[PDB]
C-alpha cells in the first residue's frame, strides 16, 4: 500500500506557520481533488491553498486514505512549535519583526491585488485619521518598534491612559497587530494569574489590555485586580532577568509591550515601570470624521497592523526598514504613489480636522 | 480479511454534519442489513438513513466486524470539526446563512412531505401570530439577518427586553434556530465565565439568554451576575478585535447575536453596546389567541426557525434571498400559494387581533 | 489461533441492554462452561444467562483465552450507548414506553413464573393499597403516562407535595420505575448543578426528589438550595427549547417528570411550571393497613413499577395499551382473573379502608 | 517463544479474591522458584502461596520473562471485580454470608493449626468478655446477622450509642469484620460526601463510624457534620429504593449496617431511621478484667470477626448455621469441646464479672 | 536484533530497592562501558555501581540501544513496589527491622571503610552526646524499638515535647532514620489531610513532626491545625483496626511512631493516645559541647540512624540483636573496641557534661 509523507505534511504546516491540528487536517484534505479542475485554484483568493495544491496533490490523495490522520497532523504542528522554540532563542529581534512585516505584506499583496476586495484609498484614509491621533505619529510608531526590537531592561513598557473611545484601545490593538503579539487580561485574582501570564511564551510583544484599579467607582470606573496584580510583576515588566512562565513550560525574559487603562490612580512603584506614558484625550473632530467615514469601522481598518505599516511605507524612506524587505517596500511605495500624493494626503488630514468625510 | 473504508465512514459523517461519535457509530451500524428488505428505507422518514443505506451497505457489513469501531468514528467526527475550522475561515457569512437555510429547507421538505406528519397550515398560523408580535415583523427579521451577515463592529448586538411571556424569549429562540447559533448563560461568577464563552467557537451567532441584574428583588426579579459580567465583555460584544476563547482553543472575533433580559437597570457602558433595543410588552389578544390555538405550543412552532423562514418565503420576493437557494424558494412559494392566499393570511392576523382561534 | 467474535459479545450486550463493562465481562465469562452440565441453566432463574448460554458457549471459551477482554467489552458497551443515541432521536415516545413495559413484563414473567419466588396475591394487595391512596388512581397513573408520552411544552411536570410517609415518595418512586427514568438531587449549590442535570441525558423521565426550601426551620423542615435552583431552570422544566446538558455531552429537550417536596413555600414563578399539583395527606387507615401487611414493605412492592403496571392491567381494557403489547396484556389479564375477582379486589380495598390486613 | 497463560494468572486472582494489582504481581513472581526446594512451601504458613505454588510454577517462570506483567495482572484483577459485580446481582444474601464465614473459617483453620501461632483459649477468653458486654449476647449477634441478611426496608440500621471505651467501638468493629463490610466517615462537608458514600459499592454491610453532632462542646464532645449529613441520607438508610453511588459507578440499594456515636442529640427524623438502639455504658469490671488479660488487646482479639464466629459456634447448634457450612461447624464444635466446657466457660464469665484475669 | 533482559533490569532494581524510574534508568545506562577500564569501579565508592557493573554490562549495552527504556524501568520499579506489598503482609516486624539494620550496616561498612571518608571517632562523639541527652539512653532507644516491633494497640505512640533546640527534633529524626520511616505534616486543614496520611502506606513507622496547637501566641508559639487534626485520628494512632489510606490505595493498620511538638496544651482525648511522653529541657552544657564539636552538626551525625545503631552496638551485647545480624554485630564490636574503650567513652561523656569539646 501507498505510504503518506509525514515530512511533506510537516513542510506544508511549516510553510503556512500552522498551529491548529484541525485546521491543518481540513486544509490538507482539500488538496485531494485534481488541481486542473479546482475552483479554489481558479479563484486564487486563498494563498495557503492555491500556492500549495499542486505540490501536495498526490500526498493528499494518500492522506485521504490514512487511518492515522490526526497523528500525522500532530507531528506537523509539533514541528511548527519546535521551529518557534529554535527561533525564539536564535533569531535576532530585528529578524522577528522582518518575519511579521513579511506576513503583513503577503496579506496586503492579496487583499489589494487582482483577487482581493480591499480598497487601498480606504486604508489610506485610516492612515490620515491615525496620523491625526497624536503629533509626529510616524515617529511615535517608529520609536515604539525600536523600543520592542531593542528590548532594553526597564525601558520596554509604554502606558496608554485615557477614557473610552479616545483612540487608546485602537492604537494599542493596531500596534499589537503590527508586531504580532498577544493580549493579556490581569483583572482576575492572583490564583489564576500565572496561567494567563503563560500566554506570553515565545511571544514578540504583549498588551495588558484594559487594566482596572480600585476606589474609582465614584468616577463611574469599574473595580478590578489589574493595577494591584501589575504592581507585583516588576520582574516581568523590567525584563532584567528570566521569569518562570507556565501554561512549568518555559524560562524566558517576559515580552515587552503596552499596558492600557482608564483614568485610575497609578501607584508610584507601578508608574516607575513605564519609560513612556501617552495620555489619550477624546477629540470631537476625530469622532465626527469617523462617523462620516463608516468604512473605517465596518472594515476594521483602524485596528489593523496593515494600516500602521502603510503609514510607515508612506512617511518613511526605504533605509528606515530592514535590508531584507527593501524590494517589497519599494514596490509598495510605487503602488501608493499611483493613488495618493503628499497634496491629496494633506487634504485627507485637513478633512479629519474639520470632522468631515476623509474621502472626497 | 476485508478492510473497512475509513474515508467512506468520514464521507457519511461529512454528508450528515455528524459531530457525535456515538450517534455516528449507531447510525453506521444500522446500514449493515440488506437495503431491499429494510423497513426504515421503505418508511422513508429519516433521510440520514434512507439516502445513505445503499451507498454504505457493504462498508457497514465490514464495519460491523471491526475491532476498532470507536477510532474509525473518532477520525470521521474529527474530519467534520476540521471542515468546520476551514469553513469558519474561508466561507463568506452569506454562504454560512445559505448552508443553514438549506438545512432548514431539507427538514421542511421532509416534515411537510409524503412521509412527514407536520401540518403546513398550523405553521402558517404561527407565521400570523409572529407577524402580530411586532410592527413590520418581516422587516425586523430581515434586518436582523443583515446585522448577523454584515457583522459590523459595534453594530452586531440587539437587546430584547420585557417581562415573562411577552414574546421576547420566543422570538430570540426562533431567530437562534433560523441562524443556527448557540445559547449562553452568563449568570455564573467570572471564574466559570471563560469556559461558557468558549461555547461560541466557530458559531454563526449567539444568544445571551435571560441575563439577570442586581437590586431588582423589590420588583420580584431574581438576582444574578449576568449584567455585571456582560459589562466586562466589551471586546466580545463590539467585535472590533479577535478574542481568545477556550473550552486555549481558538482566537476569533466573538460571534454577533442577541441579549435577552427582564426589566433590570442597564448600565450606560453596557447600553452603548446595543445597536438596537426591542421592548416586549404582553398583549392580552396574543395570549388568548395562543390559548385557542394550542397546536402552536404543543408542536413547538413559535420557537422554530422553519416558522421564521416560512414568514420570509411568504412576505419577501425571490430576489431577497441568495441566488444559490432561488430554485428552492420558488418551489416553496408555489407550495404556500396552494394553501394560503393574501386574503386568508389577513383573516388569520385578524383572528390573532381578536384573541380568537387563528384557524377557522 | 482462534479469534473471538467482538460482534457476538456486542450482540449479547445489545440483547441484555448492558451498560456496565465489568458486569458484561463477568456475565460473558460465565458462558465458558458446558451448557449441558450448567447448574445455572438447569435452575432457569436468570434469563440473561440461560437464554444466551448455548448461543455464546463457543465464543465465551475463546473470550476466556483473550488478552484483550476489557477492550472487547468496552466496544460492546459503547454499541449499547450508540443504539440508545439513535433511539433517543428516532423512536417515538410511545415506542419508548412499550420498550419499558416489555422490560417490566419480562421481569413479571420470571418472578411470578415456575422458577420465580414472588407471590402475585401480595402484589395485588399493593395494587389495592395504591388504589386507596388517591381517588380515580388508575386514571391518575394513565394521565401521568399520557403527560410523559405527549411531552407537551409547559405541561410536562407534576408537583407532589406533602409531609413524610404520606404516599408522596412511594408513588413518585413507583411512577419512576414504571417509566424507567432517573432521580435527581438539586439541594446542592449551583456550582455542582450542571453535572447533576447531565444525569437526564437520553432519559425518558426524571424525578427531582425531596426538593428543599428555606425559612421553614420553625416548622421542623430542613434548609436547602432545591427550590431556589429549580426556579432558575425554567427552560429545563418547560421543554420549549433544547438545553445544553453535560456529564458538553448532548443538546436535547430536558426530560419531563415529577418534583417531590415537603410543605415549603413555592415561588409564583416556580409554581407556574407545574400543570398539576397533587397534595398528599397522611391517612391513619393506610399506615395501619400497611403495618398489618408487612410483606408490602419487606418485598418493596409499593415502590415497584410492576405493581403500577398490574394496577393498569387490572383496571384498564386491552385497547388502552399500545398494539405492540396487546398479546402480553391479554395473557396477564387471564393470569390475574385466575387469582382475583372484582369482588375479592373490592374486599381488599375495604380491608385497606378499615386499617386491617389486606389479605384474609 | 513461550506464551504466558493470562487465564491461569486470573484463576489465581479469582481463587485468592485478589483486588490489588501489585500484590498479585508480587505473589505470582514468588511462584517462579522450584516448589521442591521452596522454604515458603515447607513452612506452610501462607495458604495463598503453598496451595498454589505447584499449580502456577511453570506459568510463573514464563510470567517472570514477560514484558507485559502489569497488564496481565490488571486483566486478572478486573475479572475479580467482574465476578464481584455478577455476585452482587445473582447471589442471595445468605450465600454472601456463607462466603464470608468460609473466609473466616479458612483463617481460623490456619492460625489455630499446626503452622499457626494463635492460642484458642485466648480467643475463648474474648468470647467470655464479649458475652459479658450485653445480656443475651449470642442472640444480639444472631439477630444482627438476620437484620443484615434479610435487608428489610426501614429495618436495616442499628444505632450504637455511648461514651469512649464502652464496648461500642469494639462490638461494631467485630460485627463489621464478621460480615465483611466497610467503615465510612461522614464528618466531612456535603461536597466530599458522595465520594465517601461510593465506598459502599458491592459491599455486604457498612459502619458509619464515630458520627459527630453539634453544640455538645459544653460536654467535651467534638463538633462535626456527621449527624447533619446522615439526616439528609434517608434513602440510603431506608433501602426502599436504589441510590446512585459514585467513586457515576453503580445504581444499587445502599448496604445495611450500623451507625456508632457518642452521647449527641439525635434529631427525630434521624432517630426514626433505626430499628434498634443499643446504649453502651462503661462497666468497671469489664475494664479491670481486660487490664488483667492484656493478650486480648495486644492480639486484637476483641475486634475480630473470628471471635464473634467462635461465640456463635460455642453457643448455637449446627442447624442455626447455613447447610453449606454444617461440616465445618461440626469440626469446630469438636475442637472447642476438647479445650473448654460449659463449666470452664462459666468460670471465665465469673472471672470477667469479678474484674480478675479471665484465664486461671 | 539483540533483546534486552527486562528480568535482569528488574533484578538490579530489586537488589538496590530502587523506587525511582529515572534513577534506575541513569544507573543502568552507566553500566554500558567496559568494566575493566571503568573509573567508578576502580574508585569503589558506590556499591550500587561497582557490585553490579560486571553482572549487568552486556545487558546495559543492549539497554543503551533500546527504544523502550522508560517502560523497561517502569516494570522494574513496579516489581520493587510489588515485593514491598508482599513483605508488608508476610514479613514479621522483627524481619522488617533486620532489613533496615542491614541497610544501615551496608552504609557503615562503606563510609568507615577503605573507600569511605567518615571518621568513626566523630560518630562515637555523637554517641556520647546522645547518651547525655536522657538518662538510661540505650534503654530508651531499645524500648522504642520494642514498641515499634511489638506494635501493640494503644501502646504504639510516644510524645516528644519541648521548646526549640532541646534535642527533641534531633532524637525523633535519628529514631526515624534508625527504623526507616516517613515524616508527616498535619498542620494543614482536614481537606488535604487524607493525602498526607496516605504517605504512611507500607511504612514501618512515622513521625508527626512539629505538631502545632492554638491560643499559644501569647507564649510566642505559632498557630496550626496539627493538635486538632491528631485528636480526630484515634483509629490511626491506636492501631486496633485497619484504616483506609489513599494517595483508595491500601487498607492497613496505620504505622506506629512519634508525635513531636512544642509546649502546647494537649487535649485529654489526645493525651490518652500516648503510652509515653518524654519532656525535652534545653541544657546549657549540651549546646556548649556541640559548639565546641562542630563536626557533629556539619556532618549530620546527631540526626543519623547510624549513630543510634553505633550506640546500640557499643552498649548492648550480641544477644540483644536478632540472630540474623549476629555476625555483623560481632565484627562491628571488634571495630569499635580498636578505637574506643569504656574509659575513653566515659571521658567523652565527662567532656559533654563540662560543655567542652567531646574529642581531646
Ligand atoms: C461611534 C462610537 C464610538 C466611536 O469612537 C471610536 C470608535 C473606534 C475607534 C476610535 C473611536 C474614537 N477615537 N477618538 C478619538 N477622539 N474621539 C474619538 S472616537 C465612533 C463612532
Ligand atoms: C399559557 C402560558 C403562557 C403563554 O404565553 C406564551 C407562551 C409561549 C410563547 C409566547 C407566549 C406569549 N406571548 N405573548 C405576547 N403577549 N402575550 C403573550 S403570552 C400562553 C399560554
Ligand atoms: C412504618 C413507618 C412508616 C410507614 O409509612 C409508609 C411507609 C412506606 C410507604 C408509605 C407509607 C405510608 N403511606 N401513607 C399514607 N398515609 N399514611 C401513610 S404511611 C409504615 C410503617
Ligand atoms: C486501657 C484503656 C482502655 C480500655 O478499654 C477498652 C479498650 C478496648 C476495648 C474495650 C475497652 C472497654 N470496654 N469496656 C466496657 N466497659 N468498660 C470498658 S473498657 C482498656 C485498657
Ligand atoms: C547552634 C544552634 C543551635 C544548637 O542546638 C542544637 C542543634 C542541633 C541539635 C541539637 C541542638 C541542641 N540540643 N540541645 C539540648 N540542650 N541544649 C541543646 S542545643 C547548637 C548550635
Ligand atoms: Zn486548488
Ligand atoms: Zn435502510
Ligand atoms: Zn448456563
Ligand atoms: Zn512455595
Ligand atoms: Zn564500573
Swiss-Prot record, chains A, B, C, D, E:
Molecular-function GO term, any one: DNA replication origin binding
Cysteine disulfide partners in this protein: none
The enzyme's E.C. designation: 5.6.2.4
Top-rank taxon: Viruses
Residues that bind ATP: 162-169
Keyword Hydrolase included in the entry's annotation: yes
Compartment list: Host nucleus
Enzyme class: isomerase
One of the GO BP terms on file: symbiont-mediated suppression of host innate immune response
Transmembrane segments annotated in the record for this chain: none
Main subcellular localisation: host cell
Cofactor binding mode and count: DNA helicase activity requires Mg(2+).
UniProt catalytic activity: Couples ATP hydrolysis with the unwinding of duplex DNA by translocating in the 3'-5' direction; ATP + H2O = ADP + phosphate + H(+)
Entry annotated with the keyword Transmembrane: no
Functional description taken from the UniProt entry: Isoform large T antigen is a key early protein essential for both driving viral replication and inducing cellular transformation. Plays a role in viral genome replication by driving entry of quiescent cells into the cell cycle and by autoregulating the synthesis of viral early mRNA. Displays highly oncogenic activities by corrupting the host cellular checkpoint mechanisms that guard cell division and the transcription, replication, and repair of DNA. Participates in the modulation of cellular gene expression preceeding viral DNA replication.
UniProt name for this protein: Large T antigen
Taxon lineage: Viruses, Monodnaviria, Shotokuvirae, Cossaviricota, Papovaviricetes
Boundaries of the shown chain within the full protein: 266 to 628 of 688
